[PDB]
């Protein structure tokens, strides 16, 4: 019966909890304490990319590590050139509210989404020379938060109606759907192996989904508020997340435990974006304190502050080659660090 | 530097000038957010507006750019993401004034949106629609049967109007930082646009005073 169902659910919860308690031996701090400190890290603003009109919300890099795409709430998609500070395209938009952008690995397509409940895909390479929209995906009943590419015809979409789905571009209809998050999904990331992905849905919960199998594998719960950012460790067996509890965390997909608690007393604001570094030794995080901070994976001691903005940092990214780090905030300016 | 980067620079300069052209039109823009119920008559108000998901309607009054945003079915959103409309200068609230059962739910919705912390820099304007029936039910229907504070006789039109105005005004917490205008207008009237323009003018006047003189 339903009461028996509750009893079985509680028993399964107890089994999972007991197994997780059994798997623990020591702490990551204990394991990594004789390791040498990374040292003081001081960086400088090398290039400022001015030209936007309104607040910038997100940006994404590319495979060539030269071209980046930025988007704002005025309704413009501007593609920049990092080295020479020369604008390449300025794609005009129809809907003036967007909250995500993406760059195809091949370099022939860009995507964006917002409150229109519709995904838009643009074709950069065209004989005429004008960037034009190719497909207009529709079918969601909630606002689109984040979108990422997997192939030249496969895209992954997360929405606020507690659904995540995978589409076929030419076909224009969804292939698989993912259900199980109680709250609305906010952020997602793709594994380097391109066979699994993880996302958080504002319920202090992280779930791992499989592209081909189509059911959730594991679930992690360690926070006390909505999760705002997520990204993958370089290898592919760890992911880190940040929330409004002013605390970041690191998990393991094989051990099934949380390892470390990046925390400090002075910070009382939320986390906007989180990204790793090339060798998995830095965990940069964007705070609401009108600044950004740099942490350590195995020490969790602060290294440096990339201050220099006048408002809230909203996006963060690290180039594929491992050269530069980009920041975008509501002052309508992008800055390229080193 | 190579006869090609020069052309790239020229293309960049053309794009920059194209953006700088739109900057001026962006700067002199006034945004309005419309939130209303099903019976509020927002459809009729929008219809009479132009005779003289997220939908957008643009109009011009006295050579001033205006922008109205209509949100339907997304008012139930209660997360921080939806608070991206943090640059609007005024919020309209069309409300029915006929049915005293619906007045209650309208009051809770008003409480829901006006006390939100992000919208602490918006001049809230409240248009009481209908106001043609209420003149015909004051002498017929007694509003005392729904609320238990109205001292004045429900057949008194002015007393009922003061009752409703006080009930709406007292709903806002945190005293009052930004003003709260109100008017008793129907849908056939044509001066509502002028009323909105005058209210926005007063709001900008107050902002300019604070920014420049008193500080």
């Amino acid at each position, epitope marked *: 019966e339903l009461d028996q169902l509750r009893q079985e659910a509680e028993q399964l919860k107890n089994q999972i909890r007991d197994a997780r308690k059994a798997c623990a031996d020591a702490t990551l701090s204990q394991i990594t304490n004789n390791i040498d400190p990374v040292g003081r890290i001081q960086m400088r603003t090398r290039r400022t990319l001015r030209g936007h009109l309104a607040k910038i919300y997100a940006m994404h890099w590319g495979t060539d590590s030269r071209l980046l795409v930025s988007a704002s709430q005025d309704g413009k998609l501007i593609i920049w050139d990092s080295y020479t500070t*020369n604008k390449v395209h300025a794609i005009p938009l129809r809907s003036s509210w967007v909250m995500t952008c993406a760059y195809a690995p091949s370099g022939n397509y860009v995507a964006c989404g917002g409150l229109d409940n519709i995904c838009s895909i643009y074709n950069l390479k065209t004989r005429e*020379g004008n960037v034009r929209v190719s497909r207009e995906l529709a079918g969601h009943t909630g606002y689109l938060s984040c979108c990422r590419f997997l192939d030249d015809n496969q895209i992954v979409t997360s929405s606020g109606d507690t659904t995540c789905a995978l589409w076929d571009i030419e076909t224009g209809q969804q292939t698989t759907t993912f259900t199980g998050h109680t709250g609305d999904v906010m952020s997602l990331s793709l594994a380097p192996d391109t066979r699994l992905f993880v996302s958080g849905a504002c319920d202090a919960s992280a779930k791992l989904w499989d592209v081909r199998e189509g059911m959730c594998r594991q679930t992690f719960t360690g926070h006390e508020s909505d999760i705002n950012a997520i990204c993958f460790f370089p290898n592919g067996n760890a992911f880190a997340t940040g929330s409004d509890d002013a605390t970041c965390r690191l998990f393991d997909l094989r051990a099934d435990q949380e390892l470390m608690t990046y925390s400090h007393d002075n910070i009382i604001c939320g986390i906007t974006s989180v990204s790793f570094s090339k060798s998995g030794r830095l965990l940069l995080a964007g705070y609401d304190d009108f600044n950004c901070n740099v942490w350590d994976a195995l020490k969790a001691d602060r290294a440096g502050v990339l201050a220099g903005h006048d408002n809230r940092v909203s996006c963060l990214g690290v180039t594929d080659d491992g050269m530069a780090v980009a920041t975008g905030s509501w002052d309508s300016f992008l800055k390229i660090w080193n | 530097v190579s006869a090609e980067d020069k052309a790239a620079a*020229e293309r960049s300069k053309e794009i920059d000038k194209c953006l700088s052209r739109e900057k001026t039109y962006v700067k002199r823009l006034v945004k309005i957010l419309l939130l209303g119920a099903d019976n509020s008559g927002k459809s009729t108000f929008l219809k009479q507006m132009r005779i003289i998901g997220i939908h957008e309607y643009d109009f011009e009054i006295k050579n001033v750019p205006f922008k109205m945003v209509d949100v339907g079915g997304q008012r139930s959103e209660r997360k921080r993401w939806f608070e991206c409309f943090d640059s609007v200068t005024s919020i309209l609230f069309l409300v029915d004034s006929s049915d005293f059962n619906r007045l209650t739910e309208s009051l809770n919705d008003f409480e829901t949106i006006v006390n939100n912390r992000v919208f602490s820099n918006v001049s809230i304007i409240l248009f009481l629609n209908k106001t043609d029936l209420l003149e015909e039910k004051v002498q017929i229907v007694s509003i005392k049967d729904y609320f238990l504070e109205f001292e004045g006789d429900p057949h008194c039109l002015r007393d009922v109007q003061k009752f409703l105005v006080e009930c709406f005004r007292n709903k806002r917490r945190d005293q009052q930082q930004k003003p709260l205008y109100h008017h008793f207008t129907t849908a056939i009237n044509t001066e509502n646009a002028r009323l909105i323009f005058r209210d926005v003018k007063d709001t900008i006047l107050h902002d300019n005073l604070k920014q420049l003189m008193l500080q």
Partner: single-chain antibody
Amino acid sequence: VQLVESGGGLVQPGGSRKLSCSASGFAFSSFGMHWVRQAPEKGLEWVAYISSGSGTIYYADTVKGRFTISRDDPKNTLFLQMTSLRSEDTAMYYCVRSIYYYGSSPFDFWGQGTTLTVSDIVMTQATSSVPVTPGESVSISCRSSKSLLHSNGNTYLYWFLQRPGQSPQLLIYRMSNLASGVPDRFSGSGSGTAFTLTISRLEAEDVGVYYCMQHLEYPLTFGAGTKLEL
């Protein structure tokens, strides 16, 4: 897309004439335009170039002050004016489209052009027409004087093909990259002042005259070319 050229015909020594070019099928404002002439049975030569938005105009040193170039955006028309014609100007004219930004394909489309009759870095393209049979691989080398390796790590040399009775078509741009709608059998490489085009397994519709080009600094230079045919 289609580009048409008109305004050509028989003329007497002296006088004047205006040429016309028609564009239809693409964004005319974004693209820049060039003019290229060809002697009856000789090489090619660059004439002029107007940038996007009619910002900057460059002219050839062979003739200057007697030619005028202007564009008309709303009608998608390009026209050129000539005065004081000379016997050296007896040539059939061409129109060229080119765009400039990171990762572009300049000099992609060539118009058929028109005819007319009145009454610097140097390239060494030895002609030495090599007889060839189908299925054999060939290599053609073009020589340049000044090193074409600008410090930005970019080589600026192009290739072209012109079948008889047709217009030149782009094959390889920036010394390595292939163009759109070209067979993968075409391949090229080289180093500074060392340029070679390695074709493999020749097929039909490969007869014509090839050409090499520079784009390092104005003015532009062409070459005679070799007739790859048997």
